[PDB]
Amino acid sequence: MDMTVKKLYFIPAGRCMLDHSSVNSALTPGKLLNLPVWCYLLETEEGPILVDTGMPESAVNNILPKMTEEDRIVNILKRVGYEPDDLLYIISSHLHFDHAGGNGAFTNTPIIVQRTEYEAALHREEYMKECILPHLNYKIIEGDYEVVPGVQLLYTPGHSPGHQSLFIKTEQSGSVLLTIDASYTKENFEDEVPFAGFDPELALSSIKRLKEVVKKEKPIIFFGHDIEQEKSCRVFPEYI
């Protein structure tokens, strides 16, 4: 039997303001939403694994990032009690600025990223250099992938060219699906309400596949940028 994740920690990593049409493509532009940015820390038998790394330090006190010094991944690292080199793996759901802005902090740890995301970040205009530094220890994968027992990546392209979501089994909670940006909000997922993405058609098929996973596994699901779900989540220092 595969080991489960001992602890899954949800870690607030600042906020980002967007037009409300980002979460529902049918909404009339001109109203702001202030969305939560997340990273997640997984304590496993082989060691700690970090999913996403927050926003670039250039966003501190500066799409409108709402980021303070506290939200920098290394200050997050300080609060969880780890140095960058303690991490077994970094997992990048994708290389958008609110998910990979802290990547440069990890220069030894393998950073798991989808080939289509990595290759897109080398060429596409929307990618900030902070998110695609050339000499990090990239572990480039393609498609679904087991990172360690209890931690699996589901390839969910659409929102970005190589976006990936997480399927985890934890000791306390059992099966957990972290959609990340494969669905910002519950309704993007359940009701297939269209939202901001590189390839909405592909995003929809990725949602459909996640639905097949949900039918089989009946996991608890946590969405990428959901202000309604946000405050009822147990967050660091609590875990699930």
For residue 159, the minimal CB distance to Zn ion (Å) is 6
Question: Which residue, 22 or 109, has its beta carbon nearer to Zn ion?
Answer: 22
Cα–Cα distance between 199 and 194 in angstroms, integer? 11
Least distance (Å) between residue 79 CB and Zn ion = 21
Q: Which of 22, 96, 113, 188 binds Zn ion (CB under 5 A)?
A: 96
Residue ranges of alpha helices (H) inside the chain are 73-80, 97-100, 115-121, 186-190, 200-217, 227-230
Tell me the closest approach of the beta carbon of residue 34 to Zn ion, in angstroms: 13
Q: Report the C-alpha gap between 138 and 99 in whole angstroms.
A: 15
Interface region with Zn ion, contact rule CB under 5 A, candidates 2-10, 98-106, 121-129, 146-154: 98-106
Closest by Cα among 120, 18, 125 to 66: 18
Place of tokens 């000791």: 171
Site for Zn ion in 173-192 (CB under 5 A): 181
The answer on whether 85 is annotated among ligand-binding residues is no
Contact 109, 139 (CB under 8 A): no
CB of residue 94 to Zn ion, shortest distance in Å:
6
- Is the omega angle on the peptide bond into residue 12 within 30 degrees of 0, that is, cis? no
Closer residue to Zn ion in complex, CB, 72/96:
96
Q: Does position 57 bind Zn ion by CB under 5 A?
A: no
- Residue 135 known to bind ligand: no
Tell me: does residue 98 bind Zn ion (CB under 5 A).
yes
Residue 173, both tokens? 């909670």
For residue 70, give the 3-state DSSP assignment.
helix
Residue positions forming the annotated binding site for Zn(2+):
94, 96, 98-99, 159, 181, 225
Under the rule (CB under 5 A), what is the footprint of Zn ion?
Answer: 96, 98, 181
